Design a protein around this nucleic acid. Structure first.
Ligand SMILES: [Mg+2]
Ligand SMILES: [Mg+2]
Ligand SMILES: [Mg+2]
Ligand SMILES: [Mg+2]
Ligand SMILES: [Mg+2]
Ligand SMILES: [Mg+2]
Ligand SMILES: [Mg+2]
Ligand SMILES: [Mg+2]
Ligand SMILES: [Mg+2]
Ligand SMILES: [Mg+2]
Ligand SMILES: [Mg+2]
Ligand SMILES: [Mg+2]
Ligand SMILES: [Mg+2]
Ligand SMILES: [Mg+2]
Ligand SMILES: [Mg+2]
Ligand SMILES: [Mg+2]
Ligand SMILES: [Mg+2]
Ligand SMILES: [Mg+2]
Ligand SMILES: [Mg+2]
Ligand SMILES: [Mg+2]
Ligand SMILES: [Mg+2]
Ligand SMILES: [Mg+2]
Ligand SMILES: [Mg+2]
Ligand SMILES: [Mg+2]
Ligand SMILES: [Mg+2]
Ligand SMILES: [Mg+2]
Ligand SMILES: [Mg+2]
Ligand SMILES: [Mg+2]
Ligand SMILES: [Mg+2]
Ligand SMILES: [Mg+2]
Ligand SMILES: [Mg+2]
Ligand SMILES: [Mg+2]
Ligand SMILES: [Mg+2]
Ligand SMILES: [Mg+2]
Ligand SMILES: [Mg+2]
Ligand SMILES: [Mg+2]
Ligand SMILES: [Mg+2]
Ligand SMILES: [Mg+2]
Ligand SMILES: [Mg+2]
Ligand SMILES: [Mg+2]
Ligand SMILES: [Mg+2]
Ligand SMILES: [Mg+2]
Ligand SMILES: [Mg+2]
Ligand SMILES: [Mg+2]
Ligand SMILES: [Mg+2]
Ligand SMILES: [Mg+2]
Ligand SMILES: [Mg+2]
Ligand SMILES: [Mg+2]
Ligand SMILES: [Mg+2]
Ligand SMILES: [Mg+2]
Ligand SMILES: [Mg+2]
Ligand SMILES: [Mg+2]
Lengths: 122, 200, 169, 131, 67
RNA sequence: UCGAAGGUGGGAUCGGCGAUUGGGACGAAGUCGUAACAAGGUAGCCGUACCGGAAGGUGCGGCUGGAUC
RNA sequence: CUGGGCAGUAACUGACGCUGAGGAGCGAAAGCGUGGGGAGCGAACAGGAUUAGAUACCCUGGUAGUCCACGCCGUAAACG
RNA sequence: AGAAGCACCGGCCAACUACGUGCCAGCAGCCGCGGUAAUACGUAGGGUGCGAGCGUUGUCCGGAAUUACUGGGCGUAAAGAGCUCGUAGGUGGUUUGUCGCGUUGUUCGUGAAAUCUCACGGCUUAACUGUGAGCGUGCGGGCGAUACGGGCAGACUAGAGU
RNA sequence: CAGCUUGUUGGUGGGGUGACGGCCUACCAAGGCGACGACGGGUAGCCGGCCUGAGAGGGUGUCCGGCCACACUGGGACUGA
């Protein structure tokens, strides 16, 4: 558009949004994990999803998903929270690392076993 | 690391006999597995991936080492598929195969790796040595009167020696004339699809 | 012994009183492998009955693509309905670099050394028509001299004069 | 108003090449008559001449067509615009259709092509790519 | 400015990205040993030692004065 | 004389909290209408005014992204 | 009382041209201020009918406003 | 003889069957999968990609010609100010002469070393390392060119005004 | 963030310094900067380089090497090339 316009009012790319806040530059972040409860998904895809209201050490309050079957988180367990967002849950953008501070790994796993956290065999 | 597994299994998936002559191949020239006889979908990425797999397991070269060969094949003048097979051919275990001092590729790798060869009077034990022009490839003086070395003496006639190297008499020592261009390279594989694989 | 590659197959539809009436289209590229290529669309009820119509149409719209011995003569850029395909010649070592729609027209025509990039629409039908519109813009160095009345040694550069004599010797 | 008289010159040649006219006519200047010589020596037009109009002079250019209706001029493109001037050194002179075209480079030794300004080692302003 | 003259220089230069010749101006303070320079005045300067806080130039001569 | 920290004073600016309150988004298979899409049952939208549970209704001017002969 | 446009003559000046960030002026209708005027039409309003309801459509009435003077508003599907 | 694991196997994207499960348990980057025959969930077999590593998350560039100078748009998709007048700014018709600021040629100074590309050499190869040459897009000083842009001093009537 | 500046912009006579200089001081003149972004607010050590990219660009300043700034916070001189 008329080169003198680009000299006067130059180009400027669009503002990128911070796609995962509340970790503030950290790949993992631990919390205190109050209110372990259970939430329902959207209009299709009905189930019972296991979430938690983790209070991270960034002094923020986010909602983390607990993957795998079976967990032992009650009210004050130290969890370690990483990224990744769950689609059918509307406002959940975080996940609990299984095989962490106070999250045991998923028992009876023999496939893929590194996600979900599990020693080989004894 | 090496592969250290079944050798016919990766000659059946690629639909191409990689080692020199095999009776386990050509009884079942289809890929292995319980779904072995199924109709495969001829993709374009499959023709480019399996053509690169023809070049790795013929030579016994892992992926992070075969990629560095591509990073200088594309950077030298000439072509890219030419100079990729040029620097793959100049590996010292491939020199022992073409000179007729070993049966298959996996024992030409050990005879270099176990330290049975000098080059300029220098004791090498790496398979990835790249011989330059005018290199002599000599055998150790200790490693004569040895079973895998005396079996390579009378059997110097059944496989053709290429024209870019020369074998001489009672001293089994290999003389490298020049780096091979295209014609004296054995062709189980086409070369332009490996260049098109890394373009993705 | 022609080369042919089916590019895309989609199930088109048509709503009637009762319900839907399905059909199959199949864009097919048929080439000589040396210098010729054709494009035919073709459509029928059954999927092999539509590739069979695509080949019989593509063998009726051949056009000669001017080569030099592995690459095209000069860079072009063709305009389809809304597809834009940029063609750029290459050194004789580098293979064809193109998307899945423009690779079919260039491997069947016989090009070994090409750099292609689609700029406009992502539709596989219009990228093929843009590549055909780019190959019509190509013109021969012995045909640019009869158009200008000059000899070939001063309308062609010094590189692609001796790039021809390395092919047929 | 009337700015950039050389881009009008290329436009009047495009709009009659694309309509198969035998000749054009246009107002005269000494920069147009030197570009029109370079278009004649490369064989994109046939002979041009200078008439005498009412005021000033006038330039009349015969165009060239093949045995069939084949254009002799496959395009025209003004490169250095009066809102953005383009200059080029002698080691990076522009290469037009890979060599089958001509760029009208304006050097201190007169108007030259790409090949004439490369073997004489001089650079300048890139007026137009004819090709 | 009582023995100090103010000169508006001009300078043309390519843009780093768009390639257009851009015309920009400066203002410099120069030194007069005798205050004879009106408004107009194609002047000629030469830079010196720091003569004041912001004076760095001196008036050499005047050509085709304020008409 | 100048002078860091300290003391008093009225302003500037950026954030937290706040009884109560304005709207927005999304939730379920809630309640009351039927405004728009067909001439959507009174042709529709635009600016402005006043009015009405709610959509919206009517005035004045305008558009065809509506008609009519 | 006054602005612009078009054609012809080619008498005259001799590039005085084009566009124009900010800015300034003009700017349908509704509306708003002070004072006039008010036939007809007609938001709000009221009654009647229609209807499950009818704060609407249709009907009889009918205030602001529509009109004038001097200011403000500065918005329209202000559109090709 | 003392020495192999990890992810993945619906499409993208190389690689599929059986059993358990029955909108549950759970999966997932997207759109989607699971409601009694699931190549998508859990396991076993098989397979593929790598391999002393393999995967997940965080972050940046690419793909994105989705800030477009190279390289886009604006009748109806997002986008022409309601319309004109005018300030700074951007831009400028034909022609003669001149200065040589822009532009361009050439040469000396500078652009440290390392890194980077090329070519050889030395560590058993390689990473790494040494040497030689390019690179360092520039900037300053001297000497050439005047076609074009511009500055200065004139001329002309086709644009503009009277 | 649209008006900032009074030793502020300039001159003369002194003082000061390794040295030019409102650097400081007394008087005199009334200037200096700004829509090409002054004054203000947010952030940041800078570069050779590093990562990506076909290039142009985009992100970054970590090892190594050059330069700058600071040494519990804020100020101040002394000794000496
Ligand atoms: Mg390794
Ligand atoms: Mg057709
Ligand atoms: Mg288009
Ligand atoms: Mg698109
Ligand atoms: Mg898309
Ligand atoms: Mg002084
Ligand atoms: Mg509150
Ligand atoms: Mg309505
Ligand atoms: Mg309705
Ligand atoms: Mg109704
Ligand atoms: Mg209606
Ligand atoms: Mg009403
Ligand atoms: Mg109306
Ligand atoms: Mg006159
Ligand atoms: Mg104007
Ligand atoms: Mg009115
Ligand atoms: Mg009122
Ligand atoms: Mg009134
Ligand atoms: Mg009144
Ligand atoms: Mg009523
Ligand atoms: Mg009424
Ligand atoms: Mg009046
Ligand atoms: Mg007004
Ligand atoms: Mg508006
Ligand atoms: Mg109107
Ligand atoms: Mg597959
Ligand atoms: Mg089942
Ligand atoms: Mg599974
Ligand atoms: Mg990631
Ligand atoms: Mg970009
Ligand atoms: Mg991205
Ligand atoms: Mg766009
Ligand atoms: Mg336009
Ligand atoms: Mg619309
Ligand atoms: Mg629109
Ligand atoms: Mg308009
Ligand atoms: Mg304006
Ligand atoms: Mg000017
Ligand atoms: Mg001019
Ligand atoms: Mg260096
Ligand atoms: Mg070596
Ligand atoms: Mg080095
Ligand atoms: Mg120089
Ligand atoms: Mg004082
Ligand atoms: Mg003094
Ligand atoms: Mg003084
Ligand atoms: Mg900091
Ligand atoms: Mg790119
Ligand atoms: Mg540092
Ligand atoms: Mg550090
Ligand atoms: Mg400390
Ligand atoms: Mg001292």
């Amino acid at each position: 558009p008329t080169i003198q316009q680009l000299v006067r009012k130059g180009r400027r790319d669009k503002i990128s949004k911070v796609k995962t806040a509340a970790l503030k530059g950290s790949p993992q972040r631990r919390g205190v994990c109050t209110r372990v409860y259970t939430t329902t998904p959207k209009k299709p895809n009905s189930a019972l999803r296991k979430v938690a209201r983790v209070k991270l050490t960034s002094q923020v309050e986010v909602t983390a998903y607990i993957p795998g079957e079976g967990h032992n988180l009650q009210e004050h367990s130290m969890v370690l929270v990483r990224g990744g967002r769950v689609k059918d849950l509307p406002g959940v953008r975080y996940k609990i690392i299984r095989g962490s501070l106070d999250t045991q790994g998923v028992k009876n796993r023999k496939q893929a076993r590194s996600r979900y956290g599990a020693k080989k065999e004894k | 690391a090496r592969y250290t597994g079944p050798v016919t299994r990766k000659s059946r998936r690629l639909r191409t006999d990689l080692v020199g002559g095999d009776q386990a191949f050509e009884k079942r020239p289809y890929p292995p597995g319980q779904h072995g006889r199924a109709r495969i979908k001829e993709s374009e990425y499959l023709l480019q991936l399996q053509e690169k797999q023809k070049a790795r397991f013929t030579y016994g070269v892992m992926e992070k080492q075969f990629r560095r060969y591509y990073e200088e094949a594309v950077r030298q003048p000439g072509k890219t598929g030419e100079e990729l097979l040029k620097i793959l051919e100049s590996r010292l275990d491939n020199v022992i195969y073409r000179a007729g001092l070993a049966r298959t590729r996996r024992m030409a790798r050990q005879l270099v790796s176990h330290g049975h060869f000098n080059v300029n009077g220098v004791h090498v034990n790496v398979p990835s040595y790249r011989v330059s022009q005018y290199d002599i490839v000599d055998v150790r003086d200790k490693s004569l009167n040895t079973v895998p070395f005396q079996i390579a003496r009378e059997t110097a006639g059944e496989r053709p020696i290429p024209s870019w190297l020369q074998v001489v008499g009672e001293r089994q020592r290999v003389l490298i004339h020049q780096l091979p261009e295209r014609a004296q390279i054995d062709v189980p594989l086409t070369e332009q699809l490996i260049v098109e694989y890394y373009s993705k | 012994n022609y080369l042919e590659r089916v590019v895309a197959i989609n199930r088109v539809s048509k709503v009637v009183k009762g319900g839907r009436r399905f059909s199959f289209t199949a864009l097919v590229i048929v080439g000589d492998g040396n210098g010729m290529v054709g494009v035919g669309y073709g459509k029928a009820k059954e999927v092999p009955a539509a590739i069979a119509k695509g080949v019989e149409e593509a063998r009726k719209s051949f056009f000669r693509v001017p080569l030099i011995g592995g690459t095209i003569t000069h860079p072009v850029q063709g305009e389809a309905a809304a597809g834009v395909v940029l063609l750029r010649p290459a050194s004789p070592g580098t293979g064809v670099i193109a998307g899945g729609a423009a690779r079919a027209v260039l491997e069947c025509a016989g090009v070994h050394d090409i750099l292609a990039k689609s700029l406009g629409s992502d539709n596989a039908i219009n990228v093929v028509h843009a590549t055909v519109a780019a190959l019509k813009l190509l013109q021969r160095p012995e045909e640019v001299a009869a158009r200008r009345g000059l000899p070939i040694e001063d309308v062609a550069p010094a590189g692609m004069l001796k790039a021809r004599r390395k092919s047929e010797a | 108003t009337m700015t950039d008289p050389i881009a009008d010159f290329l436009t009047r040649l495009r709009n009659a090449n694309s309509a198969y006219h035998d000749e054009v006519s246009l107002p005269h200047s000494k920069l147009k008559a030197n570009i029109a010589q370079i278009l004649k020596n490369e064989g994109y037009i046939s002979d041009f001449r200078t008439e005498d109009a009412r005021v000033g002079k006038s330039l009349v250019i015969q165009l060239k067509y093949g045995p069939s209706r084949e254009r002799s001029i496959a395009g025209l493109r003004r490169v250095s615009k009066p809102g953005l001037r383009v200059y080029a050194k002698s080691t990076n002179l522009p290469r037009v259709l890979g060599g089958l075209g001509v760029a009208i480079i304006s050097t201190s030794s007169g108007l030259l092509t790409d090949r004439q300004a490369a073997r004489q080692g001089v650079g300048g302003e890139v007026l137009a790519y004819v090709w | 400015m009582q023995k100090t003259i103010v000169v508006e220089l001009e300078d043309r230069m390519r843009h780093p990205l768009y390639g257009k010749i851009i015309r920009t101006t400066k203002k410099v303070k120069a030194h007069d040993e005798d205050s004879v320079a009106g408004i107009g005045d194609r002047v000629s300067l030469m830079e010196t030692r720091p003569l004041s806080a912001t004076k760095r130039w001196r008036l050499v001569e005047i050509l085709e004065k304020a008409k």
